[PDB]
Homo-oligomer: 283 residues x 4
Amino acid sequence: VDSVYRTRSLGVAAEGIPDQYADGEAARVWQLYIGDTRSRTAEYKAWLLGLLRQHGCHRVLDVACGTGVDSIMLVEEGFSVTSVDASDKMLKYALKERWNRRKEPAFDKWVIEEANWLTLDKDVPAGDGFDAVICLGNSFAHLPDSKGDQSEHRLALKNIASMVRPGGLLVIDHRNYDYILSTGCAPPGKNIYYKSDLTKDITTSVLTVNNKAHMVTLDYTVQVGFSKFRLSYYPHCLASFTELVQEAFGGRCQHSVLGDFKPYRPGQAYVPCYFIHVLKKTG
Amino acid sequence: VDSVYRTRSLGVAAEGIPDQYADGEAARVWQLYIGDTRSRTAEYKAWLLGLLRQHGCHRVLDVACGTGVDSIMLVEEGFSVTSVDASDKMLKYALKERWNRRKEPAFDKWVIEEANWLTLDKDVPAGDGFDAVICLGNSFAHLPDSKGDQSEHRLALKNIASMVRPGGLLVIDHRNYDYILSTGCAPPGKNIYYKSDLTKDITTSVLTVNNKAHMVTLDYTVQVPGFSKFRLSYYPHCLASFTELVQEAFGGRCQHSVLGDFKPYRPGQAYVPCYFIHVLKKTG
Amino acid sequence: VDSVYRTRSLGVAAEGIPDQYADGEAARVWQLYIGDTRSRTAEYKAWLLGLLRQHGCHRVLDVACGTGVDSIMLVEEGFSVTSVDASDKMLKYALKERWNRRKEPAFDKWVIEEANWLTLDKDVPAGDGFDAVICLGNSFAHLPDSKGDQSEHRLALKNIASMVRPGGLLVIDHRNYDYILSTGCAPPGKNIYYKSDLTKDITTSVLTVNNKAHMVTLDYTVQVGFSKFRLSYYPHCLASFTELVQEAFGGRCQHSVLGDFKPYRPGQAYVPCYFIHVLKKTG
Amino acid sequence: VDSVYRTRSLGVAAEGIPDQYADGEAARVWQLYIGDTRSRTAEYKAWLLGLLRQHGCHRVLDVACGTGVDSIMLVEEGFSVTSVDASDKMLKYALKERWNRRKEPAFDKWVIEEANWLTLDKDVPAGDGFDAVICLGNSFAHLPDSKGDQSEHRLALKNIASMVRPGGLLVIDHRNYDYILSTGCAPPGKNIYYKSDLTKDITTSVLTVNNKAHMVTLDYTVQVPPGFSKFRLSYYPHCLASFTELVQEAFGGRCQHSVLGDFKPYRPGQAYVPCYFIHVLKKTG
């Protein structure tokens, strides 16, 4: 009596017709948000390039490839890059760019593939390991804790850490969720990786379950009239993440925290938008 | 009081996480089905090759790329091929194949792009037009009649026809929906283009609205003592109605012939085809 | 990642707030359709009253009570009435009317209770049985075949038939679904029980699964500016239903079919809007 | 391409078939919870009775009838009672109880009707007004703030206050949401009106939007013949200070206001932390 019926199953497609909700308002306005990245900050570039040159890295794995913007730079700067993402929607933009530039030998040798953090061991050939593995742009926080024990968090980290060769580097960030939690507000335009050329009003929703933060949902609105879209994030605190990320290497690592590209010292006056963890695999 | 909170908007994605329902069981078994194209029938290859060479076609536009398999065979045989689709999830497999074969010259020159029949005039620069436009595999039937008056079908076709050069070909097909509606059954594994390696039980559901056929929905089941399934819907074009529609798209200014499973179709013949293929030559 | 979260579970309510979708367009236009019953046809009344008087019935069970319109008449004509429905939403209107007329002894005596055809043995005290059991207004067809084998149709009928005392009467109808299937159209205003005093444009959808009719969905459009609602039905053909209803009494019954209150002879010229089966329990 | 076909519209019913999700597991366990009202506390009975008799109230309006239990006790004790609710699913149990007891004179004169706080002015003819208006059990918190500005809360309260005669009472309560927000926890079985016979595990979820408390959502797990089944309900977490302002504003300041905590006077900074706050307003007149 109350059952519903589909034209087609969730997840499938068909020639000649747009994929499910691919042409909706939300998906359209979101396509502008992810395209709002042709102003990478000079400060972000310098710091990441400086880091990788400083540690002598050549083979880099980017495990949160997205549209490919971090990976593209590294391709242009002569690294040997493998880029990997779980989301085909975003990966589409990276593959596209590679194709458009396929006649430059550097882009011809750029490796791009689907992989999931939770099955990364199987999804990616790592050999002895990569010189550096990167997970920037606050992407790790997209993985929620559905199981309730952060077991998916630990598995993802362990798998990501296991890509790093001995003496190699893991660079991984998250946004300053300590601040967001205590103020309830996630201010817009504070992306220090890329300067936004796109105006945003953002509503911030924090969900706390049994007295433990569980989820932060941002509702983005853009002018047109005006239309909105929504994304959600797990709010990692610095102290918890610091513990999780080291656990990932079974304690065998050197660890340090940057705040917006500079050394961080707890109780320092400057409250950074982002924490970046840098980990040298000690074995 | 009754509203629902999402984690993320529909249609939206994020680094590190699989897209919506992309790892679902329905989507997995559906992947096997779209993948079931390893055995192109020799009859199909020989037929299309023959047809195109007959009319001197070099510039060919596939408006229903899908996984690229129709297009791939034309690349190999040395045509200049532009393939498009509205579907990124399927296009993915075409692109991927082109990437794997990019050291072969023909492959390098294969153009694959996003495009919708309803905006085709805008998504694709036809210049003067293509020698042959192809839309095979029963793909046209995937476009439903959301409005009741079949106006989308007419706009689609019209846009598809405008891609054909004066004196060029449109080759466009549909499954035999006269038989399916008549019997109430869509029997499985009769694909004439690619012999099925995969076994499926189909349940055929036909919706009729105010006594006009509106939709055929097939639920497919497979094994692996397993029992997973998935579902697709189609618009049941009868031969007479489609013949009218496809001509009107040209404004009557064409030579029309219909084939049934690759051979001439004579109404009232004993043989009942699985597919009707409409072959139009634009006047010019 | 793709999970949704409710304010409240499906099915529950809370003081001070309207129940789920109780105030929506569809609900509101549907409330008008079910209220469109203050013109009972003279032909209906005379026939049913005529039938019950003729067979000497006093205790009647109405197993598709709805808003109570058929039962109300029977109360007013001095039968001892028990009225039963599975839907609380509709039952609310019957209870309401009883309450308003509680000071008339006949209404004070009227019995109104929730029961489901699939558990009617347990839900309704029948003793030796009722003199007559009625299921009019094409209500039976509201029970779909979700299991695929019509097993729910048989169970419902067996339970309904078991309420009838030996020598007693079952009166049960369905709409002429033979006609609706062959034409694809379910014309509006053809209700021979109650004259519609409300204009409705109707779209008719028929679903056939593996060559067997499975469902008829009517989408009703009603000005009051258009609001729409939708109900669905199982399309019982005469030959199948005649078999099903007799099976329900294990063959031990006299059976006859009426077409819009008059004898029906197969192949007769008049195509009726409704078939009414009349069954006398032969043991 | 992506649309869905329903069998029937949402909100619509049909003879012979149960209403939408009415037989679901979540609805079945939820019925047990709304049914857990067999033991009215003696402290509650005594308190309300006293309060009303003190102000000479006879005509009493329950704007949150639910299953009727608050009203029933007033019918029995000889008041003239009008009970309403927006919810038919709950009102059903009130009506059914009145039907069963219809031979008792008091229950014959018990008026039970459909009405919404937001349209209360229209759904109920108040004439000159009622002697006491009651809205107890934390029912008011079921109304969410769909708009952001708390305007519906204000309209609702205003409407509720307009039902009170000059010099009449409004008695309206809320769970102690200061404590629930502060601790993040909504501990089970503290109902001060009806002692719980039913055991529940609660999970407490608090949503904050731009740093303002917006919703508290409780998931109750209840034991079954030994199995577990869940149902959910949501609430608006009214703090004491804000609600005290809101409930006064509804009268236009023209009232005497006092707040009780679990039936006893509340003095801010007292050691005892109440489970419920009960606001007692006397309209000036």
